[PDB]
Amino acid sequence: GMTSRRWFHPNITGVEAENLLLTRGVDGSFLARPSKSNPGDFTLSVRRNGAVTHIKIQNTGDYYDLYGGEKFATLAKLVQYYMEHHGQLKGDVIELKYPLNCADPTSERWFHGHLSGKEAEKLLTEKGKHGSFLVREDFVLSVRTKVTHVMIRCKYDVGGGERFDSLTDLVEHYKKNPMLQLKQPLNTTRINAAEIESRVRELSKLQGFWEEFETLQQQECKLLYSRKEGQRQENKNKNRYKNILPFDHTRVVLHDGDPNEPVSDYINANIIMPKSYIATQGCLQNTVNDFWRMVFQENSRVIVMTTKEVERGKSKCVKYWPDEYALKEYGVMRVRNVKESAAHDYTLRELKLSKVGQGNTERTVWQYHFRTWPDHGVPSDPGGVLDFLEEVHHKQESIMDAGPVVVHCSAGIGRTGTFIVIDILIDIIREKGVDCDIDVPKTIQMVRSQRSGMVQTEAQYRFIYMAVQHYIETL
């Protein structure tokens, strides 16, 4: 009974609130709405013994109060507390029993929110077809056959005829008896952080997640950038798969290599910029020296390993780090394993990297080896991955001038993309909280333009949503 603001009515008045509660509601019903008493503050309208009371909710920027009593980080938390505790007093007691859900479009797939008539016509032509429709903010029920914008007055009707209780009912009733014929919706992928729980329910019902991923897969044609360095005879033995190559414009360029070697400037790795990252593949025996040259050169102090060296009988990454207490040389680079510490889902190895011939070059590189990801599929609970990502974030924040975080699996696209995309999104939520707009496929596309095919499966696609929703819940 958390996260969602369904009982929140953003555009109603005190008189409308009383009317809704007295007609549509019952004793113990309630809704929240913005305060007319103070901008930014909220007012809670509740039905008690046949009449409606209005309670002031203080919003200080740091917390939410009822001008005294317990404090909460979000409005939904304040509401859940009072719904489950019943310590809402004046000295009269008020009970928060049944939320009165807002009938206006909110977290709806077909609802594009704030979007101009020209912007909707630009969207219904570039990505839309015949019968295709979108609802924008009164409400414009824009259709396409050329785009015809059917207006709607708020009871809700499209000029005349039938008055439906909610727009979710009026969008399904105008598709059966066409006024213009409605066939399929344009659909949005943007979702407000606080409403992810609702959207995840929509995408789970018969399929939303499949639709979203397939659509995203269809847009890879627009990301057919040059991979010329990756596709060369001199670099053919440096790639795990001949089809998974770095883009030339984003690739990590290596310097001062072995002159005997034909090409020394190459590694299957790309810089990812939303704090930057290096999405790289698992080490091949022949690329171990290159990986460390790159770690040194880029000033990275954190490595995120998301694969076991051996998974389902196959070599996914070669062991590129020395054993506990030991030291090893990897070409020009020396690595010393100082300490290995273990947690439930991962192991942290504290490594000391330096150029051979100079101790004045030594820096600590922290390797966060995630060991519990399944051979095939995604983890049941996103908690572990989130606790891991929080550990990696604090380490990166705690270090001065630390370079990009090197993230890798085998190919450097599947789990690498999943980890980087989850980290990018939860960072938007860290800086803006529950009141921010997040677009999972817009973010994936943005990362895909930097390294090809980041986030390989639909399982992974759903897992990003599952981790981001779970992150929101804990706030």
Author numbering: 0 to 89, 93 to 139, 146 to 153, 166 to 174, 178 to 202, 210 to 236, 245 to 312, 325 to 525
What does the primary publication say about this deposited structure?
The non-receptor protein tyrosine phosphatase SHP2, encoded by the PTPN11 proto-oncogene, is required for normal development and functions downstream of growth factor, cytokine, and adhesion receptors. SHP2 contains two tandem SH2 domains (N-SH2 and C-SH2), a catalytic protein tyrosine phosphatase (PTP) domain, and a C-terminal tail that has at least two phosphorylation sites. Normally, the binding of tyrosine-phosphorylated ligands to the SHP2 tandem SH2 domains is required to overcome autoinhibition, but oncogenic mutations of SHP2 destabilize the autoinhibited conformation and lead to enhanced basal activity in the absence of tyrosine-phosphorylated ligand stimulation. Allosteric modulators that stabilize the closed form of SHP2 have been recently reported. This class of allosteric inhibitors was designed to stabilize the autoinhibited state of the enzyme by acting as a molecular glue between the N-SH2 domain and the catalytic domain.
